[PDB]
Design a protein around this ligand. Structure first.
Ligand SMILES: O=C(NC1CC1)c1ccc(-c2cnc3c(NCc4cccs4)nccn23)cc1
Ligand SMILES: [Cl-]
Length: 259
């Protein structure tokens, strides 16, 4: 099955994901190179979803310059009826990768953490708070993690996980701030160190959301060889966002600096 973007032809290999309005295809160009193409059908799209898609493509373009931990955008086509975005194709997404590992190498964990901090730092410096980060938002490319989206448009699905959801996102039911992204990052790092997310054991979604915002529900932090890692996790998972560690503080933390 064939796709045309700005007169260039691509062969579809498989469907990576689907959204409401959109689909993402692993694709083959004329020179036998692999890409990922996102297609957005705008024919049935209110001004809201239209503007979210315009905002996403504008931010994705702007951010090309500012970090290589943001997904590469090679080309795009926008029309009143559709958007195509020709992007790099990753090896595998973080969620699938974590799912198949029994354990994570401390060095690999640290290096992926640095990638995530950098990517999220760079969107924050442009005024974007993702506010729904989770392992599926990161992608492995060249042994390096890249953030693939910004929380701006409706995101890709290959019921929803709420294991990474920040307290103040639950309280919007706007207190969402850059600290919200720190919480979610902490939850990913927590999974990478202890093998479970902090509230994985609580099966019922509503019960879990209550637990996420309840300060009397202690999160467990078993002692581990790496004391700096343990402190990162505790600082990320503070329920008061005022007391929760910031991205610049995480970038100067011993965990990422003392090697
Ligand atoms: O929509 C995306 N980003 C928003 C800013 C516009 C988006 C979605 C998916 C990908 C992307 C690019 N590459 C992948 C990938 N690669 C692994 C594969 C999975 C299935 C076949 S290959 N898995 C999942 C998602 N991938 C990149 C950007
Ligand atoms: Cl191209």
């Amino acid at each position: 099955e064939c796709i045309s973007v700005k007169g260039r032809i691509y062969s579809i290999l498989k469907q990576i994901g689907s959204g409401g309005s959109s689909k993402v295809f692993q694709v083959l160009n004329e020179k036998k190179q692999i890409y990922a193409i996102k297609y957005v059908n705008l024919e049935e799209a209110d001004n809201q979803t239209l503007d979210s898609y315009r905002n996403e493509i504008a931010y994705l373009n702007k951010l090309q310059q500012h970090s290589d931990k943001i997904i590469r955008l090679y080309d795009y086509e926008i029309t009143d009826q559709y958007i195509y975005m020709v992007m790099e194709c990753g090896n595998i997404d973080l969620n699938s990768w974590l799912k198949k590992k029994k354990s994570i190498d401390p060095w690999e964990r640290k290096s992926y953490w640095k990638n995530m901090l950098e990517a999220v730092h760079t969107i924050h410096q442009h005024g974007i708070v993702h506010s729904d980060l989770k392992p599926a938002n990161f992608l492995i490319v060249d042994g390096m993690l890249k953030l693939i989206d910004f929380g701006i448009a409706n995101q890709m699905q290959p019921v929803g996980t709420v294991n990474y959801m920040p307290p103040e996102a639950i309280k919007d039911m706007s207190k969402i701030s850059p600290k919200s992204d720190v919480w979610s990052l902490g939850c990913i790092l927590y999974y990478m160190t202890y093998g479970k997310t902090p509230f994985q054991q609580i099966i019922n979604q509503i019960s879990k959301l209550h637990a996420i915002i309840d300060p009397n529900h202690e999160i467990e932090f078993p002692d581990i060889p790496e004391k700096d890692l343990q402190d990162v996790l505790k600082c990320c998972l503070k329920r008061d966002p005022k007391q929760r560690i910031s991205i610049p503080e995480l970038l100067a933390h011993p965990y990422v600096q003392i090697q």
